Amino acid sequence: KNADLYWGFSGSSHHKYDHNGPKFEKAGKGAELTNIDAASAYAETFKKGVFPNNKREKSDILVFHNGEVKTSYQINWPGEVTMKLGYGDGLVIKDLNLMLKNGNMGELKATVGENSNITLFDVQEYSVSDNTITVTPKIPPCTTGTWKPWHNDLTSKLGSLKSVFFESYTCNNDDIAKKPLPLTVVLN
Amino acid sequence: KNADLYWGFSGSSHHKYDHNGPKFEKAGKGAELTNIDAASAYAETFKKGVFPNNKREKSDILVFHNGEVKTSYQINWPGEVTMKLGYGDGLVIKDLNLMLKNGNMGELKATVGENSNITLFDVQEYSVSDNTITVTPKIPPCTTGTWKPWHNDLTSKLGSLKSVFFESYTCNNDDIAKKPLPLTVVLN
Amino acid sequence: VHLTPEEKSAVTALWGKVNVDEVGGEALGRLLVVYPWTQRFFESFGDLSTPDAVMGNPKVKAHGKKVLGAFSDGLAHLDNLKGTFATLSELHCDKLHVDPENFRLLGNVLVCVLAHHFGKEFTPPVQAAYQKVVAGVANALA
Amino acid sequence: VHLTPEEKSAVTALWGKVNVDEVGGEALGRLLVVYPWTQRFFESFGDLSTPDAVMGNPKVKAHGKKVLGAFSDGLAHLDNLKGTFATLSELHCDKLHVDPENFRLLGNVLVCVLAHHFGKEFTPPVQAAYQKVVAGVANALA
Amino acid sequence: VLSPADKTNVKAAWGKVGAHAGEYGAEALERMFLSFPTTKTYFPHFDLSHGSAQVKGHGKKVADALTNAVAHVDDMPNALSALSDLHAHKLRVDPVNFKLLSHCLLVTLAAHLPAEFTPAVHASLDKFLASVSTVLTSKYR
Amino acid sequence: VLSPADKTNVKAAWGKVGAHAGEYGAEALERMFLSFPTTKTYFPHFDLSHGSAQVKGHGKKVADALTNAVAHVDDMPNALSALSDLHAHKLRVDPVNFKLLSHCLLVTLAAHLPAEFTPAVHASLDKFLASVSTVLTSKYR
Ligand code: HEM
Ligand code: HEM
Numbered sequence A, B: 001k002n003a004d005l006y007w008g009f010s011g012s013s014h015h016k017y018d019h020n021g022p023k024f025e026k027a028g029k030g031a032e033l034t035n036i037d038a039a040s041a042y043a044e045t046f047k048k049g050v051f052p053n054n055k056r057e058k059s060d061i062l063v064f065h066n067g068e069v070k071t072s073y074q075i076n077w078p079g080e081v082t083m084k085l086g087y088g089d090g091l092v093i094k095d096l097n098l099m100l101k102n103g104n105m106g107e108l109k110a111t112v113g114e115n116s117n118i119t120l121f122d123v124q125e126y127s128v129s130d131n132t133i134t135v136t137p138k139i140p141p142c143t144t145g146t147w148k149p150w151h152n153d154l155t156s157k158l159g160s161l162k163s164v165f166f167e168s169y170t171c172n173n174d175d176i177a178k179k180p181l182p183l184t185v186v187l188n
Numbered sequence C, D: 001v002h003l004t005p006e007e008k009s010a011v012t013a014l015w016g017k018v019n020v021d022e023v024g025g026e027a028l029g030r031l032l033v034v035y036p037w038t039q040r041f042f043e044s045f046g047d048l049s050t051p052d053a054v055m056g057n058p059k060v061k062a063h064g065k066k067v068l069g070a071f072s073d074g075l076a077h078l079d080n081l082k083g084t085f086a087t088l089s090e091l092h093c094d095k096l097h098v099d100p101e102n103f104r105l106l107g108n109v110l111v112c113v114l115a116h117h118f119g120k121e122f123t124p125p126v127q128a129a130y131q132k133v134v135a136g137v138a139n140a141l142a
Numbered sequence E, F: 001v002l003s004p005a006d007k008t009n010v011k012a013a014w015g016k017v018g019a020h021a022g023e024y025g026a027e028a029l030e031r032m033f034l035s036f037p038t039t040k041t042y043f044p045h046f047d048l049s050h051g052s053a054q055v056k057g058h059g060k061k062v063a064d065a066l067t068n069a070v071a072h073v074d075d076m077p078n079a080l081s082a083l084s085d086l087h088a089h090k091l092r093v094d095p096v097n098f099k100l101l102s103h104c105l106l107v108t109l110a111a112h113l114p115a116e117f118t119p120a121v122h123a124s125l126d127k128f129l130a131s132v133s134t135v136l137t138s139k140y141r
């Protein structure tokens, strides 16, 4: 009848000072910012993320309610949220669309600002246990040069300087923390 | 039959990093470096001193044993100790001689290095309660310009740069802490 | 220094309203408070232990007048600052050993003092013109 | 720059043993690693993300050769560095906008590279002579 | 290294800016671009004309970042890490430019708040802006 | 602002100095006095001739102070407060002189320990000596 999506966005969205990573506000249409202690289905995925050294004590997680599932899986959520990057004006992220196929392909797309069909990340793999899907993003190894752990659609929409929150030249802990966290989808 | 002298030297001798104030070692001839918990007669005088912000957790106090008293009081101790100032070579301080007169005059003198009869400080006042003398050094108010809380004999012997441990141009807490602490003399 | 006639005009007009008895003393005093190692060169001036002792020091005020007089001399010879400041350059380098970075700091403190005295009249164009002058004087002294 | 004949002698003797294929690349590479904002001027050189990527970059090595060639040109005209470096001065200021403090930093990194290559042979007198040369080149470029 | 008095001086002076934060930040940027034209080369994508809305909006972000740095003056590397990522790792701004902007912020404060711009406060603001500049130009990730 | 890697780099390189601490400090001072003669004006009371015992003994104190600064790299204002009192409040050494001595210490390390003087270590030592210099030239009492 529905699906709930749980996502911490990135480890860098959990800095002690919220200007230092993506910050979310004004969740609506089924999206909700929820304290991790009240989003237990995401507890184990959240604990395995790469977080900045100066990490927030109590974290909120994005939870998107009332998703529509077509079962391969095709899931769409009506939720919308505002993402602020540093001192910038907010950008609305909405129309989250997750496609999953053959256990090892698919992608999470969204409308970001005025641009629709923006792939946020490709899927490396996913598994289903009971009524829960665990979705792992496809992230290149951080080796040398420019490291880009999110899809090019996202950073090309954001531009060079807002993409500082989504890419790095170096492989330091706080840069690795910028990568997308995995998703937990609970089917009801 | 004898007198024991208890002295913390200065609040600045109790910095967390011992290169930041006078440091004592090689106590002999009746002088002993004693932990404050074992020199209870000095406990209340020590607690009223002006100490640097970055203060040592557990402090040692100078204790000079086997002093000779002539009763006005004239007390001499045989003890010797080495004082190191920062990265300098040590200076032996010995032959401590305390003269007290009329309740409000007198001075503490010592041999400092190769120089005898060096007044360390003049006495503002002293009081006797039971078998204990509390001796208060005469310290000018810190107003403006060069502030010199020790006798000129001491700083003129030490020279300009070693006198940085005994004087200041400013009245900041860590500079006020350079002033001589009071003495406690226990008559036995 | 290359200033346009309009920039030279703005500099000359503001300079005419400068209180020559105070501005120099304030710039030198603020140099001593803000960049406190500069007090080493003026040790003989007496009490420099607090900002109030520095600003109120009669020797700081008198020397500040001399400094302001030299910046004014630079306004008369903008196309030959090197030749005009030749004697002072020799004095501050060969005799006083003043690192030339301090000349830039003094010029910027003088710009702050002009801004503090003139307020809204020290407009961004007026500051830009004074920046060319103080850079020229500091380079000439170096 | 005013060097005594003995200082010019020490400079010329050490310069003759410099590996012209490496020292320049090492000085430029170390400038980019130690003073990392200097990488802004060489963005087109490719991978500068780590010290190893910087030092091993073929464009850093090739450009470093050109820089070393210019310091060598300064050794030929010590009494007219301003005139000799006129074209480069115009290039680095009017076109590239390199703040002149970076010229001093590059000269000091080159002194470190000479010390690293020559060890005990880069004696305090030999360094003192090279300090006059690198200050003269950095002032000429400024 | 800020003294305890430097910290209380900066907090008191910056607290007097208040609603004029954006205005002062915009004016400091305008003074910088006009006095030191080489600094314009970091903003090739901006409309840099006087009274530019882009310069005004940027000035409000600079002033808000300084308000945050003042509030967290004893934990600035942590509080400003993403600004260090942008200025030191991405833009690679030459530290001389931070001295230029800091001077123009001092000039703006002196022009608008003469009662607050005492010699002691000027000294504390200079050190504070130098410490913010060191954080934003250092690579400490 | 030192990164975690800068701190481990400085500790490893300075740890290789060991018994040669005084020798390296003395050589760095000699290089400074000879290359930048204006620095001699801070030591008018010294015998400044080559191989001077006074310069040798002073070099051992400078090197020992750097060993302490390395050991307490995350608490340097507290660990070095009496050195800040001497250099900033009493001597009032111009900060340019600290850049000169830091450069001569780098040159000495490059000459004596070429295996340790990698580009990464040179970068970390430069920032470390700049942070020690800021502490010793700041008035934070
Ligand atoms: C006190 C020093 C400074 C502070 C507090 C500061 C602060 C800021 C802030 C808050 C932003 C916006 C970041 C965001 O949106 O998340 C920014 C962006 C930027 N800064 Fe700075 N900055 C300083 C100095 C400088 C200097 C000296 C330059 C160069 C001359 C510079 C060049 C830039 C550029 C080019 C951007 C991007 C602007 C854009 O595309 O909108 N900054 N800075
Ligand atoms: C890395 C930087 C430096 C360190 C670690 C350092 C350390 C020291 C130490 C440990 C002392 C002895 C203090 C004592 O005995 O308690 C000292 C003294 C002194 N320093 Fe420095 N110093 C540095 C830079 C400078 C510079 C750049 C100058 C000037 C060019 C300078 C001038 C002096 C003078 C004049 C003395 C007094 C020497 C005497 O009378 O024996 N220092 N320094």
Ligand code: HEM
Pocket (backbone or CB within 6 Å): C038, C041, C042, C063, C066, C067, C068, C070, C071, C088, C091, C092, C096, C098, C102, C103, C104, C106, C107, C137, C138, C141
């Ligand atoms: C940058 C602009 C400066 C200007 C225009 C300037 C101008 C002057 C003038 C006109 C004199 C008096 C010359 C004489 O009559 O013999 C003087 C003296 C002096 N200046 Fe400067 N000066 C500047 C910067 C500095 C700086 C930055 C320092 C030190 C940090 C400094 C330290 C001195 C000293 C120590 C004297 C001698 C004062 C005495 O003992 O009577 N000056 N300067």
Ligand code: HEM
Pocket (backbone or CB within 6 Å): D038, D041, D042, D063, D066, D067, D068, D070, D071, D088, D091, D092, D096, D098, D102, D103, D104, D106, D107, D137, D138, D141
């Ligand atoms: C201080 C000593 C320096 C010397 C002797 C020097 C010398 C040179 C020479 C010989 C060229 C090539 C000129 C041509 O053939 O057209 C050049 C180009 C250049 N220099 Fe320097 N330079 C110095 C410092 C710097 C510094 C400190 C920077 C930047 C931080 C810098 C950035 C550049 C850039 C960006 C180019 C153009 C390279 C390209 O895109 O091909 N230089 N320099």
